[PDB]
Scaffold this active site. Sequence first.
Site: not given
Lengths: 162, 173, 172, 175, 160, 162, 160
Positions: G51, G80-81, G105, G139
Site C-alpha cells: 500500500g 510491505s505496509m 521489504h 526482496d
Amino acid sequence: YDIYSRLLRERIVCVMGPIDDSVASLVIAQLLFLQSESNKKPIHMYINSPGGVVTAGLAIYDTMQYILNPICTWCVGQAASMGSLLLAAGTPGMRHSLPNSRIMIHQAEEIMKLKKQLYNIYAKHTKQSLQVIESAMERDRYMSPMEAQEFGILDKVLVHPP
Amino acid sequence: IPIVVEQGERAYDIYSRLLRERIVCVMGPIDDSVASLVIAQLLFLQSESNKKPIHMYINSPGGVVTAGLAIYDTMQYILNPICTWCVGQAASMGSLLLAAGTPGMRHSLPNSRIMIHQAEEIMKLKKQLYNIYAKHTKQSLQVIESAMERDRYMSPMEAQEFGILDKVLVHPP
Amino acid sequence: LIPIVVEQRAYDIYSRLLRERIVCVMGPIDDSVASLVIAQLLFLQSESNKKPIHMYINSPGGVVTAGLAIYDTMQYILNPICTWCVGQAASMGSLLLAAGTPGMRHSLPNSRIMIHQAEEIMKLKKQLYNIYAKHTKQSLQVIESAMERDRYMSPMEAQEFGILDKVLVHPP
Amino acid sequence: LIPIVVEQTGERAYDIYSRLLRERIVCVMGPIDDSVASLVIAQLLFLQSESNKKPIHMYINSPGGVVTAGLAIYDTMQYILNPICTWCVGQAASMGSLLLAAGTPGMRHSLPNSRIMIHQAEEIMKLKKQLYNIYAKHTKQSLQVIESAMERDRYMSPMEAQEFGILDKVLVHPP
Amino acid sequence: DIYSRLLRERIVCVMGPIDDSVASLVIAQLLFLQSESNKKPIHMYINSPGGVVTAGLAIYDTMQYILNPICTWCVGQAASMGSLLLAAGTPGMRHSLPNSRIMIHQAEEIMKLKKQLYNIYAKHTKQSLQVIESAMERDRYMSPMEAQEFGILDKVLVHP
Amino acid sequence: RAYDIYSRLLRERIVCVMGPIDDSVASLVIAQLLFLQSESNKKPIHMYINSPGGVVTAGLAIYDTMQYILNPICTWCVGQAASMGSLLLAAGTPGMRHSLPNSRIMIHQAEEIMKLKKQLYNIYAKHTKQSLQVIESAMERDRYMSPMEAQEFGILDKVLVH
Amino acid sequence: DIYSRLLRERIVCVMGPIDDSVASLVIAQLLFLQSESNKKPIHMYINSPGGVVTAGLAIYDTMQYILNPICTWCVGQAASMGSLLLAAGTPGMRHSLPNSRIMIHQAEEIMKLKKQLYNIYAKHTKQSLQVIESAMERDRYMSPMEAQEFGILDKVLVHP
C-alpha cells in the site's frame, strides 16, 4: 439515516448544490410533504447553491409561496443568483445568514420576459424599486451578508446563536 | 433521495410517501420510461380507491408524443378526479396532461410557463392532438391549429383565458 | 428508480401491483423481459387457478423468439388474461394483445397498433401468419398482405381487423 | 429488476424465482453461466431435501451455455431421486436441449411454438464424445444418427423433436 | 454506513478531499449536532489531501458559528484546507497523531479570497501575516513536532 | 446477475468458489467463510468448487481459512476442479467431499518456487493419506482424472452417481 | 454486506491493497468499534499485497490511538505496509496462519519518510535498528516461523 433524511424528520429541508429540474423535484416533493405533516409548524430551508436553471428555481419559489407553513430560510456557505432568490423568499422575519456567507443576485426573447419576472418578485420581497433591482442585478459582485441585510434580502445575520 | 420512517418501521422513498397522499409527481421529460412509471402509479392508486382524488404535479419540458398520450389515456380511463398543478413549466406534452385534469380542478402557479407548441404518421398523429385540445379547451380546431403553430410560452393567466387552466392560485383559501 | 418501501432491493410498485394480478409489459419485449413475464404469469397461476390476470401492453417491438415465449405461456395458463393496449402495440406487442382471452382484449382509444414485421427466419415469420389467422379469424392471405404494409392503424380499424374486442374511453 | 413479492408470516420477501419453489418450479432461463449452473444445482439439491418423491417442474428457456456448466446441472438431475418434469418454453438450444432431454421419460414437454436445437484439444474431443453418449442414452437414437445430426446447424420444430425422441408430448393446455 | 453510525457519538469524520458536495455534507452534520445540544463537544477527525477553498471556508465558518467546543484530530494527513479545519479547532484541543503530516501550502477576487486565508491563519496560529505569507509558499510538509511550534496544533498524543 | 446469485446462496450457507482463483476472489471467499462461522460455530458450510486453477498465494489463503474455521465444510466439485481448485476439494472435512460423476479433477500445476512446491506436497500428503513420493509421482503427470479415480486416489470420498 | 456484518463481530478486514480509500474506511470502523466498547478486543485480519505509505501510517496510528487490544491475523500474505499493521497488533496476540507469506521489504522527503518505518519496526519487533536496515533490503518473502523468530509474530496457529 442519511443526514438530509435525519434533518427532514425534524422539518429542515436542504437545497444544496446546483438547482435543476431534478433538485426541484426533490425540494418540491419534500416541501409539500411537510405541509401534510402539519399546516402550522414552520419548515427550515438551508441554502447553498451556486446557481440554477431559472425555471427550476421559480418552481421551488412558487411552491414556497403556495405552502401555508412559515419557511425560515438560512444562507449557509454561498447563495448565488438562483439561491439568493430562494433566500429572499423566506417568511419575512426569519431569513437568516451565517456571518461570512457569499450572496449574489446577479446571474431567446422569452428569456428577457422571464428576467422581467425576477425583477417583480425581488421587488415584492426586498421592497426595493424596480430600477434599484435592475441596476443592482447588473453587477457581478458577491455582496457581504451585512450589506445584503441592508439591501433587504436578509432579516438578520447570526453569530453564536442560542 | 430522502427517506422517512413511520412508527412496524417502514422506510419510504419520499415519492413513495407522497403516494400515500395520492400525489403523483411527473417532472422532467416524458419518455417511454416515465410513462411506463406514471401509468403504473395511476393504475395502483385506482386500486386503493375509486373515489379519492389524485393530485398530479407536472414540471416537464416535453416528451415523446406516443408516451404522453399513454399517460393521457390512463388519466381518462381511471375513474378518479385528477387535480393537475403545473408547478414550474409545462411544454408540449406536459401541457396536454395539464389540460387533461378533471374540469374545474386544473390548477397552476403564477410564475409557471405554459406552451402548447410542439413519414405521414407524424401528420396523422398531430391531428389527434388538435381534437383532444378542442375537447378539453373547448376551442375550435382552427384556433388550436393556429395556436399550436406559434413558438411561444403563454403566461398562466393567458392560458386560463385560452381554457387550459381553471384557476391560478396564490395562498390557497 | 421506482417508488419503493423497505419490506419490514426494495418493494417497488411493479411488485406492489403484482398482488393485484396486474402484469405490465412495457418497453421492448426482449429475452430479459420474456424470461421475466413468463415467471410472473406462472406465479399468478398458482395463487389462483380462476381469478383473471390483467396485462397492460406498451411495447414498441420485440425479439420474435422472445414474444413467442410470452405468447405461448399465455395459452398454457388457464387464467383468463385481459390485455390492455396503452400507447404503442407494435410488432410483437400486437401479438400479445391479440393473444388475450377472447372477449377481453381492450384498447384505449388513442393507442397505435401495428402488426408489421437463414431460412429459419422465413418459416418463423410463417408461424406468425398462422397465429394471427387463429386469433383474428382473417385468412392467411389477408394476414400475409396486411403484414406487408408499414403503417400504424387506429384501434377502430383494429376492431374491424379483429385484433380488439372493444375500445374503451371510459369503463362501463 | 426481479419482482420482490412480499408475504405475511412479521413480513418477509421472496423473489418470484424463489417464491415459485413453494410449488417446486425451477426456472432455468437465459444463458447457462457458471453462476446459473451453481444456482440450479443448489436449488435442485434443496428440493430433494423437502420431499424425496414429490415431482419437480423445470421450465427451460436457454439459448445455450458453457458445455461444462450444463453438464454440471445435468448430473444433479440424474442424482436426484425426484421425478423431474421438463417444460421447454421459448427456445432450448445447445446445452439447454440436454436438460430438456434429461427430464424423466414420458413427461418431457414443450409448447408448440418452441425452438429446439441440439447442435453446439484431446480433453475437448473426449468431452464432446461424452455428449454423444448421453444423447444416445436419452434420445434412444443410435450414436451415428446423433453424431450426424449434432453437426447440422438448424433448429427443429417440437413435432420434429418429438419423433427424434428429445421430448414426449407437445401440449397447448395442461389437460 | 459507518459515517452515520459514528454520528450518534458526535464524531464527524471529514475524510477525503474537500469539495462543494463534502462541504455541504459536513455543515449539514455540524448544524444537526449543534441542535442536539449546545453543550457537548464534537470530535472531528481530519484526513484530507486538499480541497476547494470556496468549500473549505464553508465548513470553517460553521465551526466558528457553532458554540460547541470542536476538538480536531489530525489522523494521517491534513493538507491545504484540511490544515485550516485542524487549525480552526477550539484552542487547546487541537491534536495530532505523531506520524500524520501537515501542509499549509495550496480575477482579483481570487486574490481577495487568498488574503482571507492569511487573516484566519493569523487569527488561529497567532503568527504575523508576513510569516504565514512566506510560509504558505513552501511546498513542504511539516511534521507534527514542527506544526506544534508553528501553532497549528496544541499537542501530539497517543493513548490520551 | 452472477454477483447476485452468490449473495442469494449465502442465505443457505453455500460458498461458491468459481472462476480462476486470484486475490480478488480469495479475499472474498475468506470474508464469506468468516461471516458464516459467526452465524453458527457448528452449522455446516458448503463449498461449491468450479475453478480451473489460479495463483497459489490466493488459493492457500482460502485453504488456511478452511482449516482455521471450526465448522465442518462440505466440498462439492461441480464442473471442474483443477490445480488450486483441487486442493480446496481435498481440504474438505473427511467424509464431506463430493463430486459429480463427470466433473474433471487435476492435481498437476527460484528456490522459493521449490519451497512453494514442497509445501503443496506436504498438504496433499496430509489430506490424501498418500506418501509424499506418491504425490510427486502423480503430480508430475499432466492429465485430468475422473472422480472414480480421484476417490480411489483419495482426493474425495463420495461420487454422486445414483 | 459481508464486511459490515463482520463489523458486528468486532472483526475488521484489511483486504487487498492499502490505499487512501480503504485507509479512510478502516479508520472509520476502528473508531466506531472503540465507541461500542472501550475494552473488548478487535480482531483484524490482514491480507494486503502492500500500500501507499501515507495511508498505511494512517491505519497504524489509529491502531495506537485506540485502547482496545487488537489481534492481528495474517491470512494469505502481508507484504510491505501489510506487515507493519501485523507488527502493530498488541503484544502477545499477533497471529499468523502457517502457510502465509510475510515480507517487510518495500529523494530527501522519501528518506525522511522511510526513517519512520525503521523506527516503528524497531520498537515493535525489539530489533536493533541496524538489523532492520539489513533485513528490509532483501526482496524475499519469509515463512511465518521465521518471522516469529525475527519478532514480527507472537503465535503461528493452525486452529484458534
